[PDB]
Amino acid sequence: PDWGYDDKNGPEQWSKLYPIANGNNQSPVDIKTSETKHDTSLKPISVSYNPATAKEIINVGHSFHVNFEDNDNRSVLKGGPFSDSYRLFQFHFHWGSTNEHGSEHTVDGVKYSAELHVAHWNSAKYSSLAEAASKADGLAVIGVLMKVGEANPKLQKVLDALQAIKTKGKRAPFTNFDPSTLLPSSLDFWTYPGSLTHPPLYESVTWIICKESISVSSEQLAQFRSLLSNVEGDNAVPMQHNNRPTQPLKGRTVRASF
């Protein structure tokens, strides 16, 4: 690809190939709690995922993705600021070189070790992810900040699957898994209109950021960074980091459900 996270093809240079990178609805962002606007119009978040929709895990070079079958509404997200039902299709993570950083969103300037993203597309208005991907109200992503600490047992199945997709392009069946089990006990959240955090960077994401974080150990994070960005046979190139710096809010208002 013509983009990555290196010095030459990293976030700082993405605007040269993708001008929208300097847009008005870019993500992630720093959430300043003193400036958040509590909205009583926000309903609780509701997630109902069917473990049978889990499909495959893929090493995409810069990260790894766990995709789900999205032919129907067996797995959906509702409530919050949505009136329409959003269909789950994937979840993945972002992390940094060291524990000091790794998350994409930040709260009051505080950076966490990694971040979990659970993505969905508007199947109420659109017919496919491809169509919805570029629509202002096309995507919905739940972001969960991961604070380094005790090992998180709920990450086990995912972590155990990485040894099968070590190098770029590798992919394997990943089934019978319900990602709602990775979410924090409380679903209080913040929401704002944003975008994909990496190319194509479409400003089509309604973000749902959980107030409560989930844990992850230094060793578990080591496993993410142990993934390789090269194709099998070439010299190993560890996947050290894949988080984008926070972007300018530019007038946007972050709403709180609590």
Nearer to ligand M29, 119 or 148 (CB): 119
Q: What are phi and psi of 110, to 5 degrees?
A: -80, 125
Select the residue interacting with ligand M29 from 55, 78, 117, 211 (CB under 6 A).
117
On whether 65 is known to bind a ligand per the annotation, the reply is: yes
Choose one: 2-10, 11-19, 32-40, 190-198; the region binding ligand M29 (CB under 6 A).
190-198
Amino acid at residue number 82: F
Q: Minimum CB separation from Zn ion for residue 244, in Å?
A: 9
62 is catalytic: yes
Q: How far is the CB of 197 from ligand M29 (least distance, A)?
A: 4
Among 78, 87, 111, 117, binds Zn ion (CB under 5 A): 117
By C-beta, is 128 or 218 nearer to ligand M29?
A: 128
Under rule CB under 6 A, residue 246 binds ligand M29 = no
Rounded to the nearest angstrom, the gap between the alpha carbon of residue 97 and the centroid of all alpha carbons in its chain is 17
> Which residue's CB is nearer to ligand M29, number 99 or number 247?
247
Residue 244 engages Zn ion in binding (rule: CB under 5 A): no
Using rule CB under 5 A, residue 241 touches Zn ion = no
From 62, 105, 120, 241, active-site residue: 62
Residue nearest to Zn ion (CB): 117
Is 117 labelled as part of a ligand binding site?
yes
Active-site residue set: 62
* Binding site feature residues for Zn(2+): 62, 65, 92, 94, 117, 198
Q: Which residues would be at the binding site for Zn ion (CB under 5 A)?
A: 117
- Binding residues for ligand M29, per CB under 6 A? 67, 90, 117, 119, 141, 196-198, 205
